[PDB]
Design a protein around this ligand. Structure first.
Ligand code: PLP
Ligand code: PLP
Ligand code: PLP
Ligand code: PLP
Lengths: 389, 396, 389, 396
């Protein structure tokens, strides 16, 4: 009847982004879930405690739970836990699955915050973090110790856009009985679902593409099994780092357009990468959709639908040229941190060294987050900025 | 030219305006989205610099609402815009500002039901004569204009029959006869049709529908062609206390950024659904401005840019019983409910849901038949949407 | 049992402010009502249309309806309708109950907006508005015509704080079969409930005291009968001027503290009025709690609990002195419009004439909205401002 | 001195600080409440003026959150404050920043259950030794300090037994032995007790409870006595990603304005309820710091300003069965649920609701008995509250 999914059918991809994890409010029929902006939940009696499923919003909240169900469906997981930020999701992984004496392999071109929270904080608990090059899966295979509990990949990596072969790394981790965690923030599940490729856990900064509007901060942990999910949920309650109901409402809203947003962003990004690869003031361009991409074979194997909204490039002249460019990049570009949004964002990490170069972050390196503006405004602005470099 | 400046002498392209129009980073903090001014009153520096920072009281104007207004005026091509609590409040403010006892007002006879009602049931008690006519032929409008006519109120496409009105032709008639042309282009969106570009004097929008597009907020907008019209609307909005709230304006500032890609996806889905329905052996008629049998095809091709919209309609064979049974059996992802324009596909019967206070005889005279079904297409996978309709039609 | 009011008992005053019109969410037990930030409501079938009570948020919304039930209980009415602003509530009254040829009596010292929306707008529909002095009920009795449909009182009046004898005016209106509408925004229902005194309709700007935090705009119409309530509700749907769910949530929150807020504000106001009445630069002080108040007998008859947070005074020296004072009133005072808030507000209407004087608004007249700051900071600041006058 | 300025050389009085602390009218518009910065990232003018307007990314700092932080630091009497998603996140950030393998940490054995758990169940796996002792006698703390002790974590009053700890005496001991004194004064609020005034090094607050006081938001705060401590907390908050959101900070900026009058009303109600319970023939024991039989009366009178708080506890005669029956029969306006501090009066059994993972033997050793009932008093009419309790007690 009306209001039911037909039994035995599974919604197709875009339908899940619109409707996944949500049904009309049973009480009123409201098409969107109400915002449970409240801390505590009244119990019918001492015996029917938790009979309606909730007690305290630090532990679980109905709006947050609806978003978690949607995210788990989109990523292909058993369940998801939502957090105040992406960093909270990551540090909850490190907190739950590592103890003194354990070993953790982390991609050496990881997002800066992940790298720092490993080196500067968790390492003081006598946890051994080792940073290696994930572009070759045999590097991971050869670096796993008996003490290794977690292999933490990221693909594409921030900011260099290196790819990690998630299926091969997952095979390696399964054989060694090690947890494979994948940060696929830059990919989004519309381009790559690491759980489909054998990862044990996915970490998402929902701040970036899930939101996509520069509106909220948020994080998510999607677990492949009930055992892992239960561990994450328990520790989230202890750490007090759950997402708020209002943030979950915003993200429930913005996730509905993730497919059409990422399609537009990636079409723009392809055109911008093609323009930059012919510009005489540009030394190198990094985009998984152009022929110069070093890991083109893996990109064709691992990416679905698109090649994403992120790109990078190196301006000729080094740091001084990159600075001149950044200082003269006009609207509609925004000069700032973050990525994944409707508003195109550009930044030069160097201005905002030996180890920097060891990563791949060269002096004139520019990270570009492509939005959904008209691509001719974006290209015209980059062309003008380059004329000052 | 430095970071934070636009290139001088360039007009930003359309999609850029949807993302950035009316909005710059916060001067104080650089926040990429301007903050929500969730506050009622504004402190003044002194008596002599009263209103020197531009604001006094949020019923009169609010900074978040004003940012949204500048963006909407830019998108619709107007001098200025006023934002309201609902689309109906926008419409009522136009009737309140531009009509007085003794005046005559031509309204499309297939107007959105609420417009028809607030005219017939409320403003008519002030001895304003509302005449409801067929706007499909602009000469009907020309020769229905009496010397008391002050306002011509068109809608295109019409809710729910999707009749079109030739906005450019009607505006030429209205300028010749010195009458105000107001056009409700809620169903079109400015991505498909901008009445101000076609000579209308005022545009009214229910931002509830496509501007929002997420079933999240209520809102309305009036976009005025001139400063004289805009100032009248603004003054009366302050008197009637029906301004939009800062929080609603923040939501709409956010959702408007994706209006082009949303409407493109909705319209692509709607074309495929209308083709599917037009071949279906249990469907009597299909109405969609983009299918080749559309009766006003030539006007649609003249007046619609990019797309033919997310709205369609159809009649199921068998009359009322079959339409009711089809409604009761349409599965998810469809939603059975009122409203339209949203990411979530919606289906309804205008006979019960919206045009219920229109007596059946007039209901039919309009075009709202027994088996008539209004469809608002969202952005789900079109194959899920068609699967659901095909199941419901097989049950009908 | 737990979760039930005991049958046959009525909650006392302050309990209604905390809990009136609201019960824990039946679905989850959430102690606060969820925010129904949604426009439309899914229907079970064509036959069970409106079976769950909602269809479209312009017509009715669950959060708004909870607030309406609370407000109706607090004011002692059959029902309430909530609006985007106080002015929307007022203009809905004028729209619903007046037609060409009708006559409307309005207090001549009404809030400026009410006066203007009558004179400048509704008068163009051939509605005859007559402004008279409501301090004497026999003025109302003698001014009622056969065409009179509405008598619109306000007590205390903005800004002069004149009182209207609501019970006597109601008796007069009942005998003439005329609708008595009362704007009791300045009083709040904690000090005066016009429905208890025989008024037919109450109008509230919830912006002022119901909110009390300078946070939201809002309005309410509380009707004494189902017939009146139904008329107001129908026209609200036509006018499209309903309150939003988010605003209703804020007001559901802030109404809980209205009694303790108004108690503190009124204690401060009494002390400030006593200070000003001894200051040599102050010509007159207007406060219903000091002995100089002209309508002291009516204030003692008509006011409950307190004498309110509003006061007024005239500085010696006229307009120039008032301006000097306003320009030198220090924090914690705020120089701005509105009233009723935690933050003390001061304004001089003259700077921000014959008819002005006809009202009672003299040149050096200052309207003071007392907040909940420490009264010694407030008095010290007024003393300093006066030293510049 | 002009409008918008404070009088120079005057310290604003306490209630004024609750209304206005940390907040001035918006410089750009004069908005009396500063807007909600609902945005993630902040645009920079150039490379060389990076962070010149003070913000870059909302995980690190946000303008609305920073306004709330300045207000909280002013109210609690600290150098600075950091705001967090929850009280538990504040507490966990303190344990994460100031403890390392091999360190010893003295915690009150009647600490709030979540604190006890995150110590025992999580941080202990890093080879941090948490020792749980009786803080009612400060010499217990003095002689329990081992040379590995880095942190002494007190709570007063304790959740749920309402035991007090002599904050000034414990701080003197901690300064003599060069150990960090952290105090959770959630149950007290700064209106009743400011641990930083009494020599504590750090205060931790669950703003969820009384700062909010309306059951609306979750939140936490860490208030630091010095710049060195504050900078450590701020740095680690950015690493752990547990900052408060702008919307929650806006809500708390609003609710904090009424904290004094709320706590005054709650505390007046609570005194009357505790007196009523102490005379009731079906009540075994009543615990409230303001009734004359309170065991730590002298410390309460030394350490509590204005009030003795909204929290009380009692045991019903008959043990577990009678307590359960009383719970199942307490009517509205009471609410049966977790949490505390709110306008809405709340009642619960810590045995099931909060301290359930504490085994019964330890449960009793603490003071959490079978018939033990924790009561959070709101601002309803006290006669309705007493009526409800009297009915429930008659059913017990
Ligand atoms: C942004 C980012 C993070 C951190 O998420 P936050 O929401 O900023 O805390 C983690 N991983 C990647 C790849 C990121 O881009
Ligand atoms: C929805 C609608 C309106 C009324 O707008 P509301 O936001 O519902 O008040 C007006 N015109 C059209 C064409 C509509 O569809
Ligand atoms: C403020 C006010 C109004 C108008 O209410 P708004 O919410 O500002 O539209 C009406 N009556 C009185 C007495 C007022 O003070
Ligand atoms: C509530 C509570 C906490 C934990 O705070 P949350 O906001 O629930 O994370 C800490 N200490 C005390 C005394 C508490 O009552």
């Amino acid at each position: 009847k009306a209001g039911d999914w037909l039994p035995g059918f599974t919604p197709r991809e875009e339908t899940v982004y619109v409707h996944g994890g949500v049904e009309p409010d049973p009480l009123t029929g409201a098409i969107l879930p109400p915002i449970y902006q409240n801390t505590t939940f009244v119990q019918e009696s001492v015996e029917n405690y938790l009979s309606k499923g909730f007690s305290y919003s630090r532990t679980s909240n109905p709006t947050v739970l609806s978003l978690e169900k949607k995210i788990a469906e989109i990523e292909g997981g058993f369940g998801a836990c939502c957090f105040a930020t992406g960093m909270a999701a990551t540090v909850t992984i490190f907190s739950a699955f590592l103890a003194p004496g354990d070993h953790c392999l982390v991609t050496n071109c990881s997002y800066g915050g992940t790298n720092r929270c490993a080196r500067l904080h968790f390492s003081k608990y006598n946890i051994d973090f080792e940073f290696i090059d994930f572009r070759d899966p045999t590097n991971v295979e050869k670096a796993i110790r008996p003490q290794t509990k977690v292999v933490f990949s990221e693909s594409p990596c921030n900011p260099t856009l290196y790819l990690a072969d998630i299926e091969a790394i997952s095979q390696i981790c399964k054989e060694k009985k090690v947890l494979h965690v994948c940060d696929s923030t830059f990919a989004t599940p519309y381009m790559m679902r690491p759980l489909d490729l054998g990862a044990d856990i996915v970490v998402q900064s929902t701040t970036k593409y899930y939101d996509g509007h520069n509106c909220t901060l948020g994080g998510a942990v999607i677990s492949s099994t009930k055992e892992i999910h239960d561990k994450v949920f328990f520790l989230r309650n202890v750490m007090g780092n759950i997402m708020s109901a209002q943030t979950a409402f915003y993200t429930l809203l913005t996730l509905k357009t993730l497919p059409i947003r990422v399609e537009k962003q990636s079409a723009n990004a392809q055109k911008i990468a093609e323009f930059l690869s012919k510009h005489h003031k540009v030394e190198h361009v990094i985009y998984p959709g152009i022929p110069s991409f070093p890991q083109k074979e893996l990109a064709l194997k691992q990416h679905k639908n698109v090649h994403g909204g992120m790109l990078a490039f190196e301006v000729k002249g080094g740091t001084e040229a990159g600075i001149r460019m950044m200082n003269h990049v006009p609207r509609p570009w925004s000069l700032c941190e973050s990525l994944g949004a409707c508003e195109s964002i550009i930044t030069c990490p160097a201005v905002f060294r030996e180890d920097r170069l060891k990563v791949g972050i060269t002096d004139g390196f520019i990270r570009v987050s492509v939005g959904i503006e008209d691509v001719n405004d974006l290209i015209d602005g980059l062309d003008y900025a380059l004329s000052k470099a």
